[PDB]
Design a binder for this molecule. Sequence first.
Ligand SMILES: OC[C@H]1O[C@@H](O)[C@H](O)[C@@H](O)[C@H]1O
Ligand code: NA
Length: 601
Amino acid sequence: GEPLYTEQDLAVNGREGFPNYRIPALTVTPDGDLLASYDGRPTGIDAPGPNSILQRRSTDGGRTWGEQQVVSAGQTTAPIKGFSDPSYLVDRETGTIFNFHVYSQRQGFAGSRPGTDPADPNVLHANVATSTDGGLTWSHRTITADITPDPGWRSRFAASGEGIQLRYGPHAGRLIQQYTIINAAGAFQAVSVYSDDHGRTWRAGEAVGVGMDANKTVELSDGRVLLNSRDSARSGYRKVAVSTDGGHSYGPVTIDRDLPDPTNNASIIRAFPDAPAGSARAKVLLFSNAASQTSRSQGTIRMSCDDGQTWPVSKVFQPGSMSYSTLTALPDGTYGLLYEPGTGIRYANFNLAWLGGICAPFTIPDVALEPGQQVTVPVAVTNQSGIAVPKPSLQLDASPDWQVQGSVEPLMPGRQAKGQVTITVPAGTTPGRYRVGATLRTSAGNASTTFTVTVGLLDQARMSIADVDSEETAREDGRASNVIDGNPSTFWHTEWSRADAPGYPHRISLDLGGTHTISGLQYTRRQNSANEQVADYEIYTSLNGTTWDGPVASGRFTTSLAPQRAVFPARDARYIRLVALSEQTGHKYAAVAELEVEGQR
Ligand SMILES: OC[C@H]1O[C@@H](O)[C@H](O)[C@@H](O)[C@H]1O
Ligand code: NA
């Protein structure tokens, strides 16, 4: 029915006993009682500040809230004791409550020394409070010696927010809390901690990932576990993985470019946690996070109705500052959102009608073309809503001076719809990749997708590296072929891990896959570091890749994060070469996120 958003603080900084409140946690009890947990920070810092774990209770479904009670009390007189980064987990089968948090002594996450004795003051401990009675009374234990089977795992902390219980498959019942660890080589890794015995005993799964951090899991309509992680390598995105063995082990980790993230915690839940395995409702996920690649702001809810493959629906809940957010499914059928507005801990409620979407994701393929050209690309709407909509329309958001229109057949339940998008790119459009937004506008909700229209660039897929002067592959992935992989988040980086690596000049040559009329090169700097930016440069081209004609163009790049063009009289060529002559502030290394070649396909 009617859209609903509502919002109210639970904690403000310098009020009710602490000068700082952070790190939100939120669950629903087998009663329907809502529990909000969070850091009370005397000295305003994460571990090892002598922090407390706090909690409040709503016995009327999120309208009103009881006293600010202490679950875990920090010791601020020496020996100091810190308890921080809270995360709930309900076992709805026994109905027991867990609340995981760190127990820190002298050392934070950074300086945690290997070992697992509770008494050791240089270990950051894994703690879990236990409550068998709805979260009123609490028992306390230290589980580090159970979840460190690799001795070089020198550090750990449970991902703040809320954890899961598997409802399906051979592992049904299993409780799963996510951790981040530090291994011997000091890489940040993701790992599930689980219990097959309702909390009695806990163990660690197989560590997966590099550049990981605070991360969450959700069980999909088929019982697979989706991991969704914070990227500590600062990609601008969420990292993702999947387990087919109930959180023991995950497959390859990828950057999820559907999911821009500023290096912040995020949350991912089942919208319908009790639905049968395999059902339409069992594929529904809500995702909350800072929807900006660069700042903790524009908090955004996304809805997936296809196990998180596609994310058709999104809506901003907070324009301004928004750090950690966590979601929880309410018994009333609405949703709890506990986030960080900046003044402490806020509690928000929304319903699915607020989100304002239609479960009907659509695909419109990427298209390549020269300027002057007209092209029809099809639309395929996968109507997952199961409802009739007489007259849907397609709004497109393309460049100001393009000729664009969208169209979509009537929307029918259970069956797909067809649509079309015609595009004319006028003569004189700047060569580039154009991200065009498409919106499906309908009576019962909107869905939207993006697709790229490449204008006068050559196909990267046909390209290869012909030569590179220098590349780092030992201590990080700085392969030259990264300039032609599509991903501004992966880069070429000249060797750095050895001291005798060359400085400038640097060189990278592309083989174009064939001979093409070419007229320019677009350079994209490395996005997450500023000391390997190319300044002075020359460009060369070749037909046979050994006789080089040039410099055909020359100049100096800016510190602009966007693609920058270097243009030259059109000419046939099978190869193009970039010579980086200098760095922006004089440094040894070059990094390049992307090279595109302006030319005729
Ligand atoms: O030695 C310089 C290196 O510094 C590292 O910290 C960085 O991750 C590398 O990309 C490289 O720039
Ligand atoms: Na790249």
